[PDB]
Amino acid sequence: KQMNVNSSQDTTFEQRSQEKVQAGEINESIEFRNQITTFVHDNPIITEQLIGDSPQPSGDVRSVSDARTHSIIDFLE
Amino acid sequence: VGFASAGTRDIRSSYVEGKFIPQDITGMSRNHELDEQPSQECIGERILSFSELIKRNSWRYVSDEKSLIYPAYAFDNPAAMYTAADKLPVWTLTPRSGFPTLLTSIGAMYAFYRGGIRLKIVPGVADQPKPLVEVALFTMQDQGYIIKANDYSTDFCSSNIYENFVTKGIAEVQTPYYSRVNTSVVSAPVLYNAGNISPLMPNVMYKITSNSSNILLGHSAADDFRFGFLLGAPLAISATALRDNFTGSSATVSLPTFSNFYLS
Amino acid sequence: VGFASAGTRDIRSSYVEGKFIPQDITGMSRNHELDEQPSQECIGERILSFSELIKRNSWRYVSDEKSLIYPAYAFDNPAAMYTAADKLPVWTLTPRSGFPTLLTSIGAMYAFYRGGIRLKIVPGVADQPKPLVEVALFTMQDQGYIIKANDYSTDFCSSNIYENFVTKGIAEVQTPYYSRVNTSVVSAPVLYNAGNISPLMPNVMYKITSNSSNILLGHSAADDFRFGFLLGAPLAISATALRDNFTGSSATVSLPTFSNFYLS
Amino acid sequence: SKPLTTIPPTIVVQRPSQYFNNADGVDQGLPLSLKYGNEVILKTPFAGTSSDEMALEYVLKIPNYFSRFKYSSTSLPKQVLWTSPVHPQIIRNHVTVVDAPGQPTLLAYATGFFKYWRGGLVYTFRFVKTNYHSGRVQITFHPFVGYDDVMDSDGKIVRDEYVYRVVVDLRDQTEATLVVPFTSLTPYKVCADVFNSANRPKYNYEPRDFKVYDNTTDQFFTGTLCVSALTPLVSSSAVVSSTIDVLVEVKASDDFEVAVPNTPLWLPVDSLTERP
Amino acid sequence: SKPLTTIPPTIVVQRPSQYFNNADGVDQGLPLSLKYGNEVILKTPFAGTSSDEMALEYVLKIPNYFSRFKYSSTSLPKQVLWTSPVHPQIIRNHVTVVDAPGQPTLLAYATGFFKYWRGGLVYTFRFVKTNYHSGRVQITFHPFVGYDDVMDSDGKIVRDEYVYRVVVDLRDQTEATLVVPFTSLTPYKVCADVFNSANRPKYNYEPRDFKVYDNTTDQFFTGTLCVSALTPLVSSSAVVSSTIDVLVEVKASDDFEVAVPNTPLWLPVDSLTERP
Amino acid sequence: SKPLTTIPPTIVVQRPSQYFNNADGVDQGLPLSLKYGNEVILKTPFAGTSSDEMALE
Amino acid sequence: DVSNVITLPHVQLDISKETEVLLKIPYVSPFVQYDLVTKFTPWAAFLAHVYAPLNTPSAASLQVNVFAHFEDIKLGFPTSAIVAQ
User: Fold this and answer.
1) Rounded CA gap, B231 and D59, in Å?
2) Number of H helices and number of E strands within chain D?
3) CA B59 to CA B256: how far, in whole Å?
4) Mapped to the 3 state alphabet, what secondary structure does A3-56 carry?
5) How far is B227 from A73, CA to CA, in rounded Å?
6) Is B143 strand, coil or helix?
7) Second label for A17, Cα 20 to 30 Å away, from B82, C13, G18, G55?
8) What's the gap between Cα C96 and its chain centre?
9) Rounded to whole angstroms, how far apart are CA atoms E16 and C200?
10) Neighbouring residues of B163: CB distance < 8 A, sequence distance ≥ 6
């Protein structure tokens, strides 16, 4: 997942690995996190992009970006 | 691979990238596998990219000015009107920068471009006493990016090329990208205030001068030109249908072609 | 390196020679470090010296004489007048040797030069029966280093070149430095008595003859030409402002450009 | 020294514009840049991709939605639900104007720059249904026959034992994709232009109708692709609609090829309105 | 012997002046010297230097005095003392005539031969004071803002916590130099020409005013450089002047670059007088 | 740099159609194909034979 | 015509099969970054069109929800300019 997913987990067979659950349900589903939000999907999903997708090259922004970086901590300092 | 599925499987990028491979109805992929014999025996060439087609020149505009300012990187196409009402011409075309060419017709499928272009000029008259044609890079910031008769008499020290309509017959020019950005916008909007400084197109135009009362301008992509971000079919009409005259009015639409230009 | 100092530190030569290196306001020199991507992606070339620009030709003067004596190495620019008074043309230019070119405009920033120059000639009329143009080295000691119609009928055995306005269309000449000194003076003063023997410029002029009633002369630096001792900005006016007509009188200033010349 | 030349003569060919119409060769134009050899690099990636978006292999493989049909509890066994001639000049309707020629799809526009075509075409059928609709449909390819001839007078498909066929069971399944291979007596077909429905000197151009495969139509297409019902689409009317929509998309296969680029079939315009 | 030629034909291109507008290529002119290949050597040193005085790296790095301002016991905390748009078309006033366009500095004249520019600009502030004047001033760079927007209605600087800033303590110190890096959404900016203050067909050209950074001005500059007082400049009036002059010079940084040489912005003249 | 040319002149022969009547030589025609060098292969066999049906023999 | 939407970079949602669908688009524009000060020009637009109508036995409606986030983020330069409304 090139969806800059912080974590991803196909949970389709999760119910089959609970000790006190017998013959657990096989349920197509997937859970993934993006920063502070976790999406818990209860069916298949499709993840699409441009054909031959390539993020904007870093060199393109030198005309405006600062060589120094700025985070929240940097601003407070 | 399987003809059917429960849920979407034929995804736009997966097919083009070769990750999704549909099965032939006959079950034998050999039936849709490339065969090179046909092109080698019947055609004599094999075109693989529109990159090849846009390098072919086509006619864009006819000027009746001896000295003209022309919007080099403007790729717009004509406005069209249709009617089936009695005695009215069926189709009418109203150009802004010119009529469609391979460059602008292929370009209409994309959002962006980058790189240089080429210009070709056919003279209405090859005047022996004053046979030269000058094509100059025009950069005045004040000029709108539109076609206009030359009224400037102070554009000294410009980049100029000279061609001779009598000793050669057709003027040939190559224009560098000369852009303030690395990605230009196909048929970007041109405005009243605008002038010649918008970042959406190279800030460069042509100033064409000769002693021929009329000239026919054409263009094509230079060797470093490219279109990018495919959008789809552009709004279009059947070229052959432009001969329609079923309303009783004779067809009056006429594209800029050498035969239309050279003979009256 | 330190933003401030007690006493002068940013010294003219030290900075240009790289001995004084000012600090970027951001503290990261990378922010003003050369990036080659822009020129490679957007422009297609990268100009590094005015030496390159002066090798490009530009128009200098229009002659209405069929045979003319012309001051080859005279790099002076026109005298200008300005007024905002009602009904008077806002700007007026009065040339001596010609109007500004890349050669004379770049040259006006320097005190000296050395090396040869090139001449280009566009004919007002390419006369089929008498199509030749002769450009001859002119050395009479008596001639003032100024523009003058040719009245000489005794300048035998000169160095001559011939170009054909009908088979080619533009005359092209290269002039050697041929100087009595190794350092010439840009726009050296020419006097009444003077003649053609001053050491401040090559003692050589052009004698141009053709059967065209008018010709357009242009020039550029030859490959061994150089300007030296930078002085600064020369006295100058806005070229675009020459179109000014706010006084109610229509602008009458006109620089020698191909379009101005070829059409009336 | 100034010796007499000893170089022998060369025969020359005077030319106003060599390679004017070619994709290749060496252009002789005069450059407007200060550096004669000015040239910008080939940027990769560009416009978001590392792919070559100008290649026919890219452009012709983009999906073209071009048609739709219905399937319901009312459809009868062997009833033809939809047909389409197999070729690339697949068109759509202009919305603001009622001209006969219409608007080309990407596939028709792009292939329209060439007079000849050959190769396989990929078709995708998207059945918009629920898991509670149930029915079987068959997708058949009929080379060398127009659409009036795949059906009898009752709209029922005929001679289906003779053709390549895919029997699609629809319960949980919702999509079917297949490649229809090129089937032709000539290595290349013609990309169909509009035809004159009037008599010269009158001109009234309209799109060609492939109801029959004969010598007046066979130079443009290879035959007909057809979808017919094997059973009605059944379902409980208490909970689901009895009729569904089926969408169809077409695109080029790996061997698709176009040739003889010349006068394009389609002309791009910035706007299209009714003339008052 | 006199055999028939066997050399094949060559296609030719007729040309009046190949490379006329190029810095390079091979000139075809006829030389006036007796020796066809006449050429003078490249003299080094020449005119007193071994440096290349024609290189942009030399010409654009020469200092350009272009502005001055005051700082006094009267200046208030946060008061903007001076501002300048960051770009190279820095002009001066013609002394003998009152035209609006004015006289270019070396930097404006030289870059005026090109339509595009990019790169860092170096600014040097020379505070003409004694060691008995004392005050703190701050030099700030405000990309994407014109001069009316760096100040509030009281002439006080606003939002200075957000910008690169140099706090200069002035006691013994007299000079400050810094590089303002190129900050732009487009790799190149346009070298500003004068603009028409009248309505066509009337023309009255004047220099552009960068009071605001918006779509009518942002293609020419990157923003505003500003000097504001943090404290008044204090000193004993018994011995020193209470107000001082501050001089400003500008020149190109190492990465400065110009492109697209064409019609120059400035035209050199041998004299400029009022027309009677 | 932009040096003066040092290539010596070449005498030329103006010709409307070189090799017009010859079976050989090099044709100077302008091709109508998109690829300048368009050419179809020599098909063998052709029309039912591997023989050269154009040969006088 | 939805046919001109299908030729664009896109993803399709079948409400009976997929629960959600995602489309990632890289930054592409003549400007190397989006101008927060003058707002001159949004680099893209995401659109959702009906491909096949909501089909139910009686009139009905559904909410189509959108979640979005940025990635491959590149920041500009420190300035006092206001992020325009």
Assistant:
1) 10
2) 2, 19
3) 6
4) CCCCEEEECCCHHHHCCCCCCCCCCCCEEEEECCEEEEECCCEEEECCCCECCC
5) 43
6) coil
7) G18
8) 13
9) 34
10) B121, B132, B133, B135, B170, B171, B172, B173, D30, E15, E16
The whole-angstrom separation of Cα E106 and Cα E112 is 9
Give burial (CB, 10 Å; 0-12/13-18/19+) of D101: buried
Please identify which residue in the block is written with the tokens 């407070």: A76
Q: What letter does residue D267 receive in the DSSP assignment?
A: E
User: H or E stretch including D65?
Assistant: strand D64-72
Residues of C in contact with D41 (CB under 8 A): 40-41
Q: Are B66 and B165 in contact (CB under 8 A)?
A: no
Residue for token pair 């008595």? C193
- Kindly provide the b/e burial profile for residues E194-220, where b requires at least 16 CB atoms within 10 angstroms of the residue's own CB: bbbeeeeeebbbbbbebeebeeebbbb
- Report CA dihedral (G52, G57, G58, G63) to the nearest 10 degrees: -40
Rounded Cα–Cα distance for residues B122 and B212 (Å) = 10
Is G78's CB within 8 Å of E163's CB?
Answer: yes
Our measurement of the distance from residue A24's CA atom to the centroid of its chain's CA atoms, rounded to an integer in Å, reads 27
Collapsing DSSP to helix, strand or coil, B216 comes out as strand
Sheet containing strand B184-185, edge to edge, reads B184-185, B110-114, B226-230
Count of alpha carbons within 13 angstroms of residue B46, beta-carbon side: 16
* Contact indicator for B167, D28 with CB cutoff of 8 Å: no
G/F Cβ contact: 3+ pairs below 8 Å: no
CB within 8 Å: D247 and G51: yes
B48 token code pair: 């693989």
Contact F40 B47 (CB under 8 A): no
Residue with tokens 């075309």: B93
- Give which of B50, B101, B257 to mutate to test D binding, by max D Cβ within 10 Å: B50
First to last CA, chain G: 33
CATH class of the structural domain B1-264: mainly beta
Closest CA in chain D for residue B138: D32
Residue type, A72: I
Min Cα separation A20/chain B (Å): 32
Between G3, G14, G56, which is nearest D241 by CB? G56
* DSSP codes joined into one string, B219-261: EEE-TT-EEEEE--PPSEEESGGGG--TTSSPP------HHHH
What is the Cα C82 distance to its own chain's centre? Answer: 23
Question: What's the reported resolution, in angstroms, to a tenth?
Answer: 2.5
Q: Give dist(CA E21, CA B174) in Å, integer.
A: 13
Hey, are the CB atoms on C28 and A59 less than 8 Å from each other? no
Helix, strand or coil, per DSSP, at residue C61? strand
Residue ranges per structural domain of chain C: 1-264
Starting at the edge strand found earlier in the chain, the sheet holding C67-70 runs C148-149, C67-70, C205-210, C132-138, C160-164
Report d(CA C159, CA C204) in Å as an integer.
Answer: 11
Residue of E53, E170, E177 lying closest to E110 (CA atoms): E53
**Beta partners for residue B134, in sequence order:** B162, B209
Handedness of CA G46, G49, G55, G61 (dihedral sign): positive
The number of helix segments (H) and strand segments (E) in chain B equals: 5, 16
Q: Taking a C-beta distance cutoff of 8 angstroms, is the pair C54, C225 a contact?
A: yes
Total Cβ atoms within 10 A of residue D93: 11
Cβ contact D77:D223 at 8 Å:
no
Is B150:C259 a contact under the CB 8 Å cutoff?
yes
- Helices (DSSP H) in chain G: which residue ranges? 3-6
CA dist G66 and G20 (Å) reads 10
Q: What is the CATH number of domain D1-276?
A: 2.60.120.20
